[PDB]
Amino acid sequence: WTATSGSCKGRCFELQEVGPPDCRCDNLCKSYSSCCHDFDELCLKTARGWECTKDRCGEVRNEENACHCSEDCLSRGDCCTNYQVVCKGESHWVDDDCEEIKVPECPAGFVRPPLIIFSVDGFRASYMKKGSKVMPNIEKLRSCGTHAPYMRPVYPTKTFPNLYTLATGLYPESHGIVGNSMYDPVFDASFHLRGREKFNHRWWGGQPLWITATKQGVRAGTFFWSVSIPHERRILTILQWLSLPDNERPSVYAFYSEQPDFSGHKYGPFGPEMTNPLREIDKTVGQLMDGLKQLRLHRCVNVIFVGDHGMEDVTCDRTEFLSNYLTNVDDITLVPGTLGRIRAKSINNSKYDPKTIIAALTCKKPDQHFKPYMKQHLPKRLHYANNRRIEDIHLLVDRRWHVARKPLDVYKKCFFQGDHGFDNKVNSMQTVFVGYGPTFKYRTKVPPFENIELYNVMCDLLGLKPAPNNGTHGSLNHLLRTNTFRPTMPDEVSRPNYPGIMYLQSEFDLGCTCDDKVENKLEELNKRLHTKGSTKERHLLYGRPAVLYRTSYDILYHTDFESGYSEIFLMPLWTSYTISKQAEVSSIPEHLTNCVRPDVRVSPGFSQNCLAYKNDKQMSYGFLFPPYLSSSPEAKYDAFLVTNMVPMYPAFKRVWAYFQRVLVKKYASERNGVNVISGPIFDYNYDGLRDTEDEIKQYVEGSSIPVPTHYYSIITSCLDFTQPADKCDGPLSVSSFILPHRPDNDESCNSSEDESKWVEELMKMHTARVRDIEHLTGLDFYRKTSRSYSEILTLKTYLHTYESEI
Template sequence: MFKKRLVCAWHCSLLYPKQTWPQSGESYSFGASEAHRRQNITCDKCFAQCKHEIRGRYLTSVQRSPFVLGQFIIFSTLQKPLDVYKKPSGKCFFQGDHGFDNKVNSMQTVFVGYGPTFKYKTKVPPFENIELYNVMCDLLGLKPAPNNGTHGSLNHLLRTNTFRPTMPEEVTRPNYPGIMYLQSDFDLGCNCDEKNKLDELNRRLHIKGSTEERHLLYGRPAVLYRTRYDILYHTDFESGYSEIFLMPLWTSYTISKQAEVSSVPEYLTNCVRPDVRVSPSFSQSCLAYKNDKQMSYGFLFPPYLSSSPEAKYDAFLVTNMVPMYPAFKRIWNYFQRVLVKKYASERNGVNVISGPIFDYDYDGLHDTQDKIKQYVEGSSVPVPTHYYSIVTSCLDFTQPADKCDGPLSVSSFILPHRPDNEESCNSSEDESQWVEELIKMHTARVRDIEQLTSLDFFRKTSRSYPEILTLKTYLHTYESEI
């Protein structure tokens, strides 16, 4: 169970003058002069929740454009039977919510389109209301103003399409480094015990594009801003490594239905290898994590899913390492070790793309370096605000993920990177009791992740681009499962 709070009503801008908006958790009572503002508001006291406490799929609606939905969320402090609270025993009691979570079944409606432009007797998968504005503009022959919909994602509703979306242009092309440095060039502050095997292990990094077809099933993600990054190939995964953020922008791997989860040997538990393809000045150091007692590190490709003992060493490369709070590692490790394997078994294999998100101003858009506020102590390694994961399979589960010639199925998540797990009331229990439900609560659209990372996914598929836009704007709600 999770701590939930009731949405009171409207946008903050309707309730508070800008200069008097309350801080997070602060109460606000309406005065008599404001009675006209709350004709349809059913609570007399509300408090605001900071953007950093809001689920990732809401953040992307707060964009700098004339037409947006859901900019602010106001939570009430109603007394029961409509409030949600946590008793001292640590148990959560949910007694109702309404009006703010677009994945809840009761928030969904029916759209009926009638007329010569709409297809006849056509039923389509669920979509969000924000996508309708562009359709209405197409019907009226108008050019849409900038908005938070994705123009072209509903082309499949129409007989003829007046707007044909095009794939965004890639802004930064990657480098493809080979082995350029010596083991002795690095002083990471940590190492692997198998020093006599390092030369042999480093030779494995000569792998070129032979893994691309296996791990980048839908093309290489495009970077839509100016930066510097490297493509790093490995037997079991592929990464787009940022020389600016000192960590991968994305890591992609494909797990078959038959894949086995293996344990990490004791001698590898503290193993971190230098990557001789990347300059020491663009590499993280374990020394920073030893100095920062509040921060640990995790890996974007899970060592548990390595295909062989030799390939497992690749998962311990410093270029696969990302900063993580110890509390968050419980969530991440369970997702990688248990849930990825579970989804691969259920869906006949999956492709997974994971990476960091930096959104310190919580506007739902990718942060530039000057906006980043937190670093691993004594280092230039920025701490992500979230981590994302995109899990893709064939919609027809009889086809394996890497041989799919039909429509795709996608589940995406934006996981807040926090120093505690207080969002879950039973986080003191075993991860099997709460992590999967927590992850599903943070479901998101691929489009949300694209806006938070300035990456563009699914650039090379057998499907039409409008169909891919439909896939990107789909929100897997899990409502039938919760």
């Protein structure tokens, strides 16, 4: 109940929220059905439209007008945005040459350049090029300010998850808005688009920019606008707030456009009907920049023009029906469309089985346009698992398709020709970023980056300390002229041991054998040099990774590779080796097929044993540094040390063997040498973070050998591929992956074929940032390079996506 009998007289678009039952006058009252009776009359004037005309100049102030062309309007803060153009001979902002903004040029009383966030729903990245003719205001911001070719959204590439990711710097799994539609089993409550539950605070985790600002004494405009408030009125309101007295004036503002998403759903991303919504957005931008110029703020305010996600061609005839796969179709609840999430219709049903649902959905039709995953098996780069609101069963839908439960859902729920929500590496889902103002750089293009990074930068723009988030603070410093945040490397927590030869062969009882008993100070001084690190500058190019947690581990040197060996997990945390373009691949000699060798530097008690592998009928083993890439027959023996071994399912060994035998050499050939860092990952609670030893759910049978959930590699070379990886003078180039360590290859529908038909496609799907691997391992890489730390942070956030040119 609201006793809506008060008045908005003098309170239009008030910044403090009045509590029930007094009536409201803020930009959200409509959406709560809580505005005072006179809100429309006083606060939503429309008379005479939004533009001054010649005849209105110098007019006598008529307070009924939507905006004003009277002489007093500049000082009252409420001229039409084109007032000075029509009545005072001025030019439109878009018509002025751009001139570098070297310092903020603000009116007296401004303590800091304000930030305006201009957010556009469904603004696909290629609109910047393809629509450039009809968007001159936006094209000016883009070419005069700082821009990226595109910005990567978060998964799912839906509206609320992405807007709230922009506001918080957090993955949806952490902020809690995990889709446009959700069920929370703990609340026993549902979040929907239409309806009131979505207004309850309990859905919204983390700490959005407006709250960060408020707690630190920086005032915020209210970010959200009722849909029926027209764009012109939104702009006029922001401009009025900017004329408030110093003590009352917010420093951060948000504008939101429902376009072009709204039309894109109806007409497809490039429908001929899309030109007009793009014109109209541009016109709104022009109105803002003209209004800023009138207020002498166009060289003071930082403006961010940012999208939430793109838009793909999607139609009713491209829908897959779960009723074509499942017999039990009425025992499930599906969240449908461009992604799928499945749960049981009823908790009172114990005949519900996720494993049989998954099997019934796996590789059932030749051209099948979705793939089922248990959420913990989704690509780690999606970070889409660690929330009770994300259903255990997930379907990744092919770009251009929908999944639905039954055909009746699609005709009794074609209309739409566009949609979004697909995998966040899909080109059609990419969106835009432009920054313009004194704090951004002048005429600068920066590489594509992820929307999770923006919250830190928005904090930097406003002098705020960001709340803990998933951005990597400093990785976007290269967007900024000043206000950079100067990050430092984290301190190493554990220092390694450097064990020498400490054990005799016969102290080991590991059940391992090797045919290695074949026998010269020329070559014997040499191998001692190798074991003390004589070739370490070749194989460890960026310094050893730092261990950022308390643990016990040993550095182990070898001719061809160096490792950080964990006495706790009984295997390396990392193995580092360099493969030059000229390197040669060899086979495992016949006599050495099953060879495993005790490491005389490492105690029996801190070693794996071969017997456990013999007895564990499911589990086999592989090696981190591959025997195939040994520099010589004698160096090959090192690759068979028990300290280079790691547990692998035979099914996974097919993937791993192909990567090590075929793909490493191919990368070295194409990139002019590569440095490789590989290792295990343990993330049994699927939280994106390194497991402690007490979290491991699986061991090699009869042993303390923990089974990794994933294996990673980080493959680095010189960005200037004319320089070899081991002699690079400048910036680096990286690609990485986090392969799920699975007992089957059900994920790959073509896995019955030769590895050359399916393995690389699997690896591509599991591409990762170095930063994702850092979180999963508690390691910190690239500690010793010639590069600046901010540049290294940018490199660590890089994702190699394998999509073609945008």
